[PDB]
Write a protein that binds this ligand. Structure first.
Ligand SMILES: [Zn+2]
Lengths: 287, 5
């Protein structure tokens, strides 16, 4: 027995429009921002030399302390030319509009969820964000906006606090750093309440973010929209899409934008989503 | 738990 009448996108849409489904949690990663022209930052094309010990060091906290500058050089190299959220981002804004969105947990630092209209309380930025930066001095912690940080990144000057002249650091979580306390406190409360997990554009290979899927109640359906299947148990040591025991997990394989479009079409939301995306893209293009 | 690969 199960909440989905069938393990398909069509079954998920029927469930979402039933009274049984009131609260949706979205888990999103780099895959929902690649069509915005923001390739994954773990992808092997930024790996283009600052005497780094190995490749990971540019995003490890131990190296970043006392040797910033490589990071800030790479930040200027990879800084997006435009911040235009994708169809997937606006699909989550539509979820919020329809009263279905309990929370979006994101691994992305690119602020696109905010631009698409998700508010801070809707959002758990598990790896932090470039939206704000802070002076690293414990007694100061002056906050700076991205416009300020962008200016220092492109001047190729290490960003310094105007009050105390310490380093100013974008509010991201480096590898080797603890995730923000908000991540764990939101997780504790939210997964008591979730009716549907929407997992979009993540390979579920970064921890502890990836262990979110094991926090869902046993009945809660889980839809993966992703280029590749992910989140299955590792046979060398999860999601069960394909066995005779599968009862609640659904994988839709393709680009996240196309999968969100297909789900929106089943929900009767395709015209609303198209109108929202075209308006918001026109607005951003006209900045 | 630290952020890990
Ligand atoms: Zn300061």
């Amino acid at each position: 027995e199960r909440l989905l009448d069938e393990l398909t996108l069509e079954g998920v849409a029927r469930y979402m429009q039933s009274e049984r489904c009131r609260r949706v949690i979205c888990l999103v990663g780099a895959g929902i921002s690649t069509s915005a022209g923001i390739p994954d930052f773990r992808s092997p094309s930024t790996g283009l030399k600052y005497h780094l010990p190995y490749p990971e060091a540019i995003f490890e906290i131990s190296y970043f302390k006392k040797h910033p500058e490589p990071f800030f050089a790479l930040a200027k190299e990879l800084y997006p030319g435009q911040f235009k959220p994708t169809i997937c981002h606006y699909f989550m804004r539509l979820l919020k509009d329809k009263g279905l969105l309990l929370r979006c947990y994101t691994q992305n630092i690119d602020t696109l969820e905010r631009i698409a209209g998700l508010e801070q309380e809707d959002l758990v930025e598990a790896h932090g964000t470039f939206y704000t930066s802070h002076c690293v001095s414990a007694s100061c912690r002056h906050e700076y906006p991205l416009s300020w940080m962008k200016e220092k990144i492109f001047s190729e000057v290490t960003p310094k606090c105007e009050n105390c002249q310490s380093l100013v650091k974008p509010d991201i979580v480096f590898f080797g750093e603890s995730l923000p306390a908000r991540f764990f406190s939101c997780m504790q409360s939210d997964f008591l309440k979730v009716d549907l997990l929407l997992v979009m554009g993540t390979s579920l290979q970064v921890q502890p973010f990836a262990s979110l899927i094991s926090k869902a109640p046993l009945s809660t359906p889980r839809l993966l929209i992703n280029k590749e299947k992910a989140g299955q148990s590792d046979p060398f040591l999860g999601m069960d899409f394909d066995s005779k025991k599968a009862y609640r997990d659904v994988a839709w394989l393709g680009e996240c934008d196309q999968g969100c479009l297909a789900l929106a079409e089943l929900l009767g939301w395709k015209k609303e989503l198209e109108d929202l995306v075209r308006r918001e893209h026109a607005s951003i293009d006209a900045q | 738990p630290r952020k890990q690969l």
